[PDB]
Amino acid sequence: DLKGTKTAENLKQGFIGESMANRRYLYFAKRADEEGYPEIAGLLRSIAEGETAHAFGHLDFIRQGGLTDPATDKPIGTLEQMIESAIAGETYEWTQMYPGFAKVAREEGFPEVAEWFETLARAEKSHAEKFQNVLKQLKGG
């Protein structure tokens, strides 16, 4: 009964925010590492494990409710569906999103940012190919 509800939206938003929180806190922990704050770094890493649990619990409800992947709007019920979601998102990123970001970065006078986005387009293409090979393995039984 979750499809089309505000609660469906809120689970998706929760997933986005918890995902960012884990990345942010681990990035902050690396700064603590460099500067010599190991107890702060360790606390950041442990809090980040909390954010993993929160993100994964949001995804559990999203699937239990027949809602789609926050990133791709594809189903993620089965493992094969999960890999198809990965392929769809990767294809978008390597063919469309990162090339477009690189072009705009060049247009706006940020060539180093553009080369980073071009690196990421190539990297996401490789990810897409790896996930396509996974799907072939799963569909072959």
Binding site for a second copy (CB under 8 A): 1-2, 5-7, 10-11, 14-28, 30-32, 35, 37, 40, 43, 47, 50, 52, 54-57, 59, 61, 69-71, 76, 79, 82-83, 85-86, 89, 93, 97-98, 101, 104-105, 108-110, 113, 116-117, 120, 123, 127, 130-131, 134, 137-138
For residues 131 and 82, the answer to whether their CB atoms sit within 8 Å is no
88 counts as binding Cl ion under rule CB under 5 A = no
**Distance between CA atoms of 94 and 124, rounded to whole angstroms?**
5
**Distance between CA atoms of 93 and 99, rounded to whole angstroms?**
8
The CB-of-89 to a second copy minimum distance in angstroms stands at: 7
HEC string for 25-46: HHHHHHHHHHHCCHHHHHHHHH
Going by the annotation, the residues of the binding site are 18, 51, 54, 90, 93, 124, 127
